[PDB]
Amino acid sequence: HHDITFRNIRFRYKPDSPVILDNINLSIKQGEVIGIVGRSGSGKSTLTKLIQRFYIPENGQVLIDGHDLALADPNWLRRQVGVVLQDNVLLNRSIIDNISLANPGMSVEKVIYAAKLAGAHDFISELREGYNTIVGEQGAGLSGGQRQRIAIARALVNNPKILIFDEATSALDYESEHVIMRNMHKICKGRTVIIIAHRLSTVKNADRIIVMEKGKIVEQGKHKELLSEPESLYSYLYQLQSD
Ligand SMILES: Nc1ncnc2c1ncn2[C@@H]1O[C@H](COP(=O)(O)OP(=O)(O)O)[C@@H](O)[C@H]1O
Predict the structure, then answer these.
(1) Where are the beta strands (DSSP E) in 85-235?
(2) Residues 103, 105, 110, 116, CA torsion sign
């Protein structure tokens, strides 16, 4: 079963604007963990915007869990997709409010479960005010890596069938990265996962990597297979990021 399908997708942001995605064809199986890589502005984030129907393509179809998004319930779609946002933790609000910022009338139990998957529960639990701690500066002083785990918990809380990781915009402390990587298999378990990767190393072990260049998928496959294509863009990007 394919959880996400793009067929012949063409997209530009505005009527006059340049084509950003051109004839994208992609089929992602349920439970697959996919990495998306490529230079800045290749169209990686735009692809995920279309999955959420934030924009509508001028040609082609996006199908989510078999449903053409043209016809699909927008509320259902909102519930099927969880996005791990960058720099989106509200400082003026509690940790629990930040995690449940979609279904406010939801379980403390559901919040805790998501924070445990995210590897946040342990550090939250050792806070004077626990989950009621206000995130903000002089109000808690949570690190960027702590805030990122809260962001993961927020994405997981409603148990989405599809999980998307937006491209990393900063660097995380060793402890935060370590905890997340140790927990990735639990976070991704039972879900279709798309990771937009800043460093190719992040997604070395994804089921498949998709390589974008100038709005096109140019290459796709497992890491070892992409490195086997003699003049691949993947190999060049791999070389560039190497020590
Ligand atoms: N909201 C927007 N309006 C107009 N152009 C945009 C918008 N968002 C992104 N773009 C443009 O789309 C192209 C691809 O962007 P993006 O999908 O974010 O690439 P990536 O995620 O690979 O860096 C870039 O030229 C970028 O400036």
Answers:
(1) 162-165, 192-196, 208-213, 216-221
(2) positive
Residues with beta carbon inside 6 Å of ligand 1?
13, 20, 38, 40-46
What are the structure tokens assigned to 36, written together? 């998306």
Ligand 1, atom nearest to 40 Cα: 23
Q: Which residue reads 């890596």 in tokens?
A: 145
Measured CA to CA, the distance from residue 155 to residue 164 in angstroms comes to 9
Neighbours of 119 (CB within 10 A): 24
Q: What's the CA-to-centroid distance between 235 and ligand 1, angstroms?
A: 24
Full set of structural domains in the chain with CATH = 1-243 (3.40.50.300)
Name the token pair of 72.
């699909």
Looking at residue 171, its amino acid is: A
How was this model experimentally determined?
A: X-ray
| Cβ atoms < 10 Å from Cβ of 137 | 9
Vertex 79: Cα angle to 73 and 84 (nearest 5): 135
